[PDB]
Design a protein around this motif. Structure first.
Motif, PDB file in Angstrom:
ATOM      1  N   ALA A 139       0.639  -1.068  -0.022  1.00 55.31           N
ATOM      2  CA  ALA A 139       0.139  -0.174   0.099  1.00 55.31           C
ATOM      3  C   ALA A 139       0.871   1.285   0.026  1.00 55.31           C
ATOM      4  O   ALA A 139       0.551   2.345  -0.572  1.00 55.31           O
ATOM      5  CB  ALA A 139      -0.907   0.084   1.171  1.00 55.31           C
ATOM      6  N   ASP A 140       2.162   1.238   0.670  1.00 49.01           N
ATOM      7  CA  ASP A 140       2.984   2.391   0.819  1.00 49.01           C
ATOM      8  C   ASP A 140       3.397   2.563  -0.900  1.00 49.01           C
ATOM      9  O   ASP A 140       3.857   3.863  -0.971  1.00 49.01           O
ATOM     10  CB  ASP A 140       4.268   2.241   1.480  1.00 49.01           C
ATOM     11  CG  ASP A 140       3.760   2.083   3.236  1.00 49.01           C
ATOM     12  OD1 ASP A 140       2.893   2.945   3.557  1.00 49.01           O
ATOM     13  OD2 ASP A 140       4.383   1.167   3.729  1.00 49.01           O
ATOM     14  N   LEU A 141       3.318   1.910  -1.788  1.00 52.85           N
ATOM     15  CA  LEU A 141       3.543   2.305  -3.021  1.00 52.85           C
ATOM     16  C   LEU A 141       2.537   3.062  -3.866  1.00 52.85           C
ATOM     17  O   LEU A 141       2.626   3.304  -5.135  1.00 52.85           O
ATOM     18  CB  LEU A 141       3.821   0.781  -3.976  1.00 52.85           C
ATOM     19  CG  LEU A 141       5.344   0.007  -3.362  1.00 52.85           C
ATOM     20  CD1 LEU A 141       5.413  -1.287  -3.863  1.00 52.85           C
ATOM     21  CD2 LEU A 141       6.474   0.905  -3.690  1.00 52.85           C
ATOM     22  N   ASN A 142       1.378   2.984  -3.362  1.00 56.14           N
ATOM     23  CA  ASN A 142       0.225   3.687  -3.997  1.00 56.14           C
ATOM     24  C   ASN A 142       0.776   5.210  -4.261  1.00 56.14           C
ATOM     25  O   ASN A 142       1.130   5.752  -3.355  1.00 56.14           O
ATOM     26  CB  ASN A 142      -1.032   3.819  -3.157  1.00 56.14           C
ATOM     27  CG  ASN A 142      -2.014   4.491  -3.950  1.00 56.14           C
ATOM     28  OD1 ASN A 142      -2.801   3.972  -5.073  1.00 56.14           O
ATOM     29  ND2 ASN A 142      -2.003   5.885  -3.437  1.00 56.14           N
ATOM     30  N   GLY A 143       0.478   5.539  -5.408  1.00 55.30           N
ATOM     31  CA  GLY A 143       0.978   7.025  -5.932  1.00 55.30           C
ATOM     32  C   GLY A 143       2.550   7.350  -6.305  1.00 55.30           C
ATOM     33  O   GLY A 143       2.792   8.168  -6.391  1.00 55.30           O
ATOM     34  N   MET A 144       3.101   6.244  -5.962  1.00 53.81           N
ATOM     35  CA  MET A 144       4.718   6.328  -6.120  1.00 53.81           C
ATOM     36  C   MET A 144       5.088   5.973  -7.500  1.00 53.81           C
ATOM     37  O   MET A 144       4.770   4.532  -8.034  1.00 53.81           O
ATOM     38  CB  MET A 144       5.416   5.627  -5.082  1.00 53.81           C
ATOM     39  CG  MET A 144       4.966   5.819  -3.732  1.00 53.81           C
ATOM     40  SD  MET A 144       5.769   7.601  -3.128  1.00 53.81           S
ATOM     41  CE  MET A 144       7.614   6.693  -3.054  1.00 53.81           C
ATOM     42  N   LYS A 145       5.712   6.830  -8.550  1.00 57.12           N
ATOM     43  CA  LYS A 145       6.601   6.540  -9.618  1.00 57.12           C
ATOM     44  C   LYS A 145       7.864   5.859  -9.323  1.00 57.12           C
ATOM     45  O   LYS A 145       8.635   6.354  -8.965  1.00 57.12           O
ATOM     46  CB  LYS A 145       6.594   7.754 -10.356  1.00 57.12           C
ATOM     47  CG  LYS A 145       5.414   8.546 -10.576  1.00 57.12           C
ATOM     48  CD  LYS A 145       5.555   9.926 -11.503  1.00 57.12           C
ATOM     49  CE  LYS A 145       4.316  10.574 -11.624  1.00 57.12           C
ATOM     50  NZ  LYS A 145       3.849  11.416 -10.219  1.00 57.12           N
ATOM     51  N   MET A 146       7.799   4.543  -9.689  1.00 49.85           N
ATOM     52  CA  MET A 146       8.960   3.833  -9.344  1.00 49.85           C
ATOM     53  C   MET A 146       9.287   3.111 -10.663  1.00 49.85           C
ATOM     54  O   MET A 146       8.827   2.623 -11.420  1.00 49.85           O
ATOM     55  CB  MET A 146       8.418   2.391  -8.685  1.00 49.85           C
ATOM     56  CG  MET A 146       7.867   2.913  -7.246  1.00 49.85           C
ATOM     57  SD  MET A 146       8.858   3.735  -5.953  1.00 49.85           S
ATOM     58  CE  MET A 146      10.231   2.231  -5.477  1.00 49.85           C
ATOM     59  N   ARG A 147      10.743   3.395 -10.886  1.00 50.87           N
ATOM     60  CA  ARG A 147      11.602   2.880 -11.766  1.00 50.87           C
ATOM     61  C   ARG A 147      12.010   1.194 -11.569  1.00 50.87           C
ATOM     62  O   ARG A 147      12.202   0.812 -10.568  1.00 50.87           O
ATOM     63  CB  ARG A 147      12.845   3.557 -12.216  1.00 50.87           C
ATOM     64  CG  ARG A 147      13.638   3.020 -13.240  1.00 50.87           C
ATOM     65  CD  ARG A 147      14.800   2.083 -12.449  1.00 50.87           C
ATOM     66  NE  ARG A 147      15.836   1.457 -13.709  1.00 50.87           N
ATOM     67  CZ  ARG A 147      16.620   0.636 -13.222  1.00 50.87           C
ATOM     68  NH1 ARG A 147      16.765  -0.115 -12.413  1.00 50.87           N
ATOM     69  NH2 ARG A 147      17.473   0.414 -14.462  1.00 50.87           N
TER      70      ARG A 147
END
Length: 320
Positions: A139-147
């Motif tokens: 859930a902490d990855l929500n909204g996170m632009k991850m390469r």
């Protein structure tokens, strides 16, 4: 035999482990064992022209003689190797690299038939890095632009709830600086070469017997150039190739994590380890991603299920 100059080309800068602590000492062994006759010139940072995905074309077509690269920088070109990129596939780099090489020597040989394989290997399982947000659950990855480094790894990031972005590793620092990504997955070892441990303060790893993911590296020679070598020169190259090289490379890549992790801590980073419920949630998503990949492999004419099982079984064989 007659003296032979081999042009090596790759994308990381010279201080990166793949150059300074892998190809450089490899080339020194090749030089000594050939009585000074095989001379490898090392061109890092794309110093002979082109962008990182072009390394495989350059080596295939004889523009250069040897490359080190990431297979998935050219999406779909090496489809069998994608099986090793699936979530929670990898053990140590030493075990997983031996598995990769045996896989390429056997059921995956068609991916690399146009090249002389020196070794296929991989990094220690990658970690999750962000500018400041601790990743304690998906859930902490929500909204996170991850390469991620390849399409299979960006699909994993999609499956875990992130907003996925792909690019080769030399682009990551600039992308962080411009605000177009919030973080990335990479092993520790590549980070200091691009100051990435100074640009991300929060780091998450996974506990247990299998890490988050890895991505296969290719260490390849132009096939015609290899075939044109004298038999004594071929012997030198082959003494420095194959399963024994993949094992050695994996060992080295496991070791490379240690000083890089220390640099990340010295820069003020946090390290958070997933276990229990948060980890099980990611592993459940991983199972769905395996099923998605098997379908995609089947659609491309491969026995996806057989290849996934083979990868797991080869990793188990060497994880001892």
């Amino acid at each position: 035999s007659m003296e032979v100059v081999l042009k090596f080309h790759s994308f990381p800068p010279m201080p990166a482990n793949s150059n300074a602590k892998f190809v450089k000492p490899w080339s020194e062994k090749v030089l000594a064992e050939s009585n000074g006759e095989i001379k490898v010139e090392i061109y890092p940072a794309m110093q002979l022209g082109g962008k990182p995905p072009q390394l495989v074309d350059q080596v295939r077509d004889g523009v250069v003689d040897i490359v080190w690269t990431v297979a998935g920088y050219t999406p779909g070109r090496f489809p069998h190797l994608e099986a090793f990129e699936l979530p929670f596939m990898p053990a140590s780099a030493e075990a997983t690299s031996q598995a990769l090489q045996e896989y390429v020597d056997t059921v995956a040989a068609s991916d690399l038939k146009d090249y002389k394989v020196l070794a296929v290997f991989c990094h220690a399982p990658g970690k999750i890095h962000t500018k400041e947000k601790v990743i304690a659950s998906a859930a902490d990855l929500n909204g996170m632009k991850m390469r991620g480094p390849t399409r299979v790894i960006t699909k994993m990031l999609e499956g875990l709830g992130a907003t996925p972005v792909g690019m080769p590793v030399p682009a990551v620092a600039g992308a962080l600086s411009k605000g177009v990504i919030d973080g990335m997955v990479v092993p520790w070892e590549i980070m200091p070469s691009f100051k990435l441990h100074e640009l991300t303060a929060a780091h998450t790893t996974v506990s247990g017997s299998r890490g988050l993911y890895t991505t296969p590296f290719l260490f390849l020679m132009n096939k015609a150039k290899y075939e044109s070598l004298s038999d004594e020169h071929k012997k030198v190259i082959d003494n420095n190739a194959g399963l024994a090289l993949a094992k050695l490379a994996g060992q080295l890549w496991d070791g490379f994590e240690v000083p890089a992790r220390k640099l990340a801590l010295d820069a003020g980073g946090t390290i958070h380890s997933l276990s229990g419920g948060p980890l099980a949630e990611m592993k459940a998503a991983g199972e769905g991603l395996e099923a998605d990949w098997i379908k995609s492999a089947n659609d491309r004419g491969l026995d996806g299920a057989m290849l996934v099982k083979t990868a797991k079984d080869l990793i188990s064989k060497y994880d001892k």
